[PDB]
Write a protein that binds this ligand. Structure first.
Ligand SMILES: [Ca+2]
Ligand SMILES: [Ca+2]
Ligand SMILES: [Ca+2]
Ligand SMILES: [Ca+2]
Ligand code: NA
Ligand code: NA
Lengths: 346, 341
């Protein structure tokens, strides 16, 4: 885990963040010409820990993996706004306190420019490929549309061209649940000894449902009770105790302020903004791209990836029971799409 | 057009708990026939009540000339056991003078059916022509036809499944958790304290409303547009939450959401397949193509397993299609009433 200083960054809004730092992790050696970089773009609650025994995409990064680190140099940042090394709301403001409520709104476009600045500070100027799903797919899409000169190919998984009403609906309500927590303290809870654990748990429980496949959830849990508990006497259902576990697991590893900042960056995703709309922006693409979507995805439904593949100058439909999380679980299917993307960059 | 309160006395619930003096609120439209053979029971959904027709929550299908033509039929609607608009529920007074609150027992759909039947029986009604309902009302209709077939001549079951699913229990239990996390919940004993869990109930309803709508139509209506700083869809959801808080009780929301989570027509009957195959009542089953909460596969299962084809309603409105698609629902009601005649 290294930290790259990129200095002051001017955001799309005109706001400036002083002294931005971007955390970077690398697997594989950089080639003499620096022509073998594959940028792996993490999703909402991910980070730079892509691979290693555990890395959120370990199945696709390593020796002999889809991103074969004997040949490619896999680089992952922690996104701008994150909480695992990069500048975010918990980072220190110039006044010595956490940014907190003063942290500006960040867009996916800002996040791409911060990643590119980190690469440039490392002496890397063109990457072979960008790859990502979900928020990482939004980052990959904005990279190929906004900075095609810097990337030879892209894999865009499980995302749409802009945020949808249903996505903004659940995202805004997840944020509202966090802000309703008595410990949110307007986002300035850092250093107080209190954190909005309850609101973040509620947000994550609803988010987890959006990530899963409806049928698979019912196959896994049905209406089964939690073992030895009777719901009519105050007991819980199996899916209910599982959701409680998911919410608590996130609270134990993730910052509420970062969740809000990054969720907001999902809600403002729109490749068409300032470019004449989604269709005009997608038609402008000059980077070879592979697009994949998952049949059971309820958060970024397949129609969104059909649109990407139709408007960008065929869609890879992955039959999967795992919903949106298919982009993390379907190692072999995703691996084939990665290998196809890397062939386009070679 | 007056709200009547029917005393049904003591009710022993499926859990074994007993409520000493249950009251069920009732509204009626249309004259009861001399033989009492023209009763159509309308079963409301989670946040509905007995006010079906004025407007009422299903006003388009009840009235003179409507799908339930009150010139011929006597439409009767109760407020469900656990409710907050006249029937016994957590905000009702316990024998000790305080609200039931945290002492209110768990209520199942089967309990709700038995309370409705007891209210009808107290009014001298012993067999109904039809039961009709969608969503929680469809669960009530299904348990009525399976558990008490001798009391009903036909049923319309809309936008529900044979048991609660994992996704339904997931969102239901998390909506309840959001209410219970509100500082004003006070263990459910907030009645009379001057404080209510308005924020938690708003959060629950915002998430629930998304489950009731169609993904595509939400994007058609709002996209990522701003409001007039909120996004348009965000302002819409905030409005939906405030609207519910203004008219509905959090404790009842919890009690009735729990009743949805415990829905299972197979319990104590050998499982869903055995229970549905036992149906002796002609039923019409309807589902809506864009429903994200009770997806169409659940109604396919109902139709496949019940002795009785599925009526598939092409609708953009999601689960709320059962409330919005007046013409398609009306056709299904009229089919049901022909089976009862
Ligand atoms: Ca690996
Ligand atoms: Ca419970
Ligand atoms: Ca009417
Ligand atoms: Ca906002
Ligand atoms: Na700089
Ligand atoms: Na009685």
């Amino acid at each position: 885990l290294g930290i790259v200083d990129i200095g002051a960054l001017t955001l799309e809004s005109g706001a400036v963040i002083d002294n931005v730092q971007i955390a970077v992790e690398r697997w594989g050696e950089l080639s003499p010409s620096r022509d073998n970089v594959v940028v792996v773009l993490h999703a909402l609650t991910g980070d730079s820990h892509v691979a290693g025994p555990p890395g959120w995409w370990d199945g696709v990064v390593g020796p002999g993996a889809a991103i074969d680190t004997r040949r490619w140099c896999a680089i992952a940042t922690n996104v701008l706004g994150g909480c695992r090394g990069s500048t975010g709301p918990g980072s220190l403001h110039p006044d010595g306190k956490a940014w907190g409520s003063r942290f500006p709104a960040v867009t996916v476009r800002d996040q791409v420019r911060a990643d590119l600045a980190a690469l440039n500070a490392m002496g890397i100027h063109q990457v072979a490929a960008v790859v990502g799903g979900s928020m990482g797919g939004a980052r990959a899409l904005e990279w190929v549309i906004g900075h095609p000169e810097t990337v030879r190919a892209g894999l865009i998984l499980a995302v749409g061209a802009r945020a949808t009403a249903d996505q903004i609906g659940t995202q805004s309500t997840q944020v509202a649940a966090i802000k309703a927590d008595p410990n949110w303290q307007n986002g300035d809870y850092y250093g107080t000894g209190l954190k909005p654990d309850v609101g973040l748990q509620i947000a994550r429980r609803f988010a987890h449902l959006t990530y899963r496949g409806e049928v698979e959830l019912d196959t896994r849990f049905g209406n089964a009770p939690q073992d030895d508990e009777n719901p009519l006497l105050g007991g819980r259902y199996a899916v209910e105790s599982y959701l409680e576990y998911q919410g608590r697991k996130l609270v134990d590893r993730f910052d509420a302020g970062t969740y809000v900042t990054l969720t907001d960056s999902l809600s403002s995703h729109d490749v068409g903004r300032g470019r004449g709309g989604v269709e005009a922006a997608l038609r402008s693409c000059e980077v070879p791209v592979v697009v994949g979507g998952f049949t059971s995805d309820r958060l970024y439904p397949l129609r969104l990836q059909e649109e990407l593949a139709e408007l960008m100058p065929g869609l890879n439909v992955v039959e999967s029971i795992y919903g949106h999380d298919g982009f993390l679980i379907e190692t072999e299917a995703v691996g084939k799409l990665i290998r196809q993307t890397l062939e386009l960059a070679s």
